[PDB]
Write an enzyme that holds these catalytic residues in place. Sequence first.
Site, PDB file in Angstrom:
ATOM      1  N   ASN A  45      31.139  29.894  86.847  1.00  0.00           N
ATOM      2  CA  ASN A  45      30.448  28.870  87.469  1.00  0.00           C
ATOM      3  C   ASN A  45      29.315  28.581  86.831  1.00  0.00           C
ATOM      4  OD1 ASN A  45      29.623  27.383  90.662  1.00  0.00           O
ATOM      5  ND2 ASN A  45      30.032  26.348  88.558  1.00  0.00           N
ATOM      6  N   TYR A  78      23.158  15.130  82.985  1.00  0.00           N
ATOM      7  CA  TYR A  78      23.032  15.956  83.998  1.00  0.00           C
ATOM      8  C   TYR A  78      21.700  15.873  84.501  1.00  0.00           C
ATOM      9  CZ  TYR A  78      23.522  20.103  87.125  1.00  0.00           C
ATOM     10  OH  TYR A  78      23.147  20.911  88.330  1.00  0.00           O
ATOM     11  N   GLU A  87      22.022  15.428  92.902  1.00  0.00           N
ATOM     12  CA  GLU A  87      22.420  15.900  91.820  1.00  0.00           C
ATOM     13  C   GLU A  87      23.154  14.943  91.135  1.00  0.00           C
ATOM     14  OE1 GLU A  87      25.613  18.844  91.838  1.00  0.00           O
ATOM     15  OE2 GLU A  87      24.808  20.194  90.349  1.00  0.00           O
ATOM     16  N   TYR A  89      25.512  12.926  87.383  1.00  0.00           N
ATOM     17  CA  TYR A  89      26.144  13.045  86.052  1.00  0.00           C
ATOM     18  C   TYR A  89      26.554  11.822  85.668  1.00  0.00           C
ATOM     19  CZ  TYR A  89      27.781  17.846  87.881  1.00  0.00           C
ATOM     20  OH  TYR A  89      27.915  19.202  88.362  1.00  0.00           O
ATOM     21  N   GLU A 178      29.497  21.994  81.409  1.00  0.00           N
ATOM     22  CA  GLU A 178      29.592  22.602  82.733  1.00  0.00           C
ATOM     23  C   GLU A 178      30.982  23.080  82.503  1.00  0.00           C
ATOM     24  OE1 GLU A 178      28.923  22.323  87.403  1.00  0.00           O
ATOM     25  OE2 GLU A 178      28.568  20.394  86.190  1.00  0.00           O
TER      26      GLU A 178
END
Length: 191
Positions: A45, A78, A87, A89, A178
């Site tokens: 991750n 990001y 957060e 994107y 990611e």
Amino acid sequence: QTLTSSATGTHNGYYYSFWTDGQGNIRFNLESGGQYSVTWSGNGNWVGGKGWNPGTDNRVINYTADYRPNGNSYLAVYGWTRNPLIEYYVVESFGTYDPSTGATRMGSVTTDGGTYNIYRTQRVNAPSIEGTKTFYQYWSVRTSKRTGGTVTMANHFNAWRQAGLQLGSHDYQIVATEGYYSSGSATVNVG
Ligand SMILES: [Ca+2]
């Protein structure tokens, strides 16, 4: 300059952030100018890239990328904001997992020759730049995947703000790659 753990700093004038849960296989490499390359596999991750810190409301990003994902992976602008902690994107391309899945749609925005659907999601008791927290995630997902071009952040931020998605004070802002339990390779050049 190959990273051996989560890390941040500036390289060749560009801020870099690399976050990993330490799992799976991964090699994140800082390269010339605003470029970085990453090869990964296994059950990890992670998210990392190059850009700026702090981010700005009117930054116009130009980037190019050789993106080759296998599984759930994203290529996207990001970043984060604080007060409120968010957060965000701007998804340019993705793998097998569509970020819009089960997300609350908040309209759309057309910018830089493309169209993006807007969404809001929430992470509970999750890792963040402020530690373990519960916060919202904002998304702009391109209806057509691409791996290079210009991203006018002002158009995305304003679309989000008008849709009722408040943004706080800017923390970092990068062109990131990611991955989650995925594999692949990617070379991204910012600027
Ligand atoms: Ca530097």
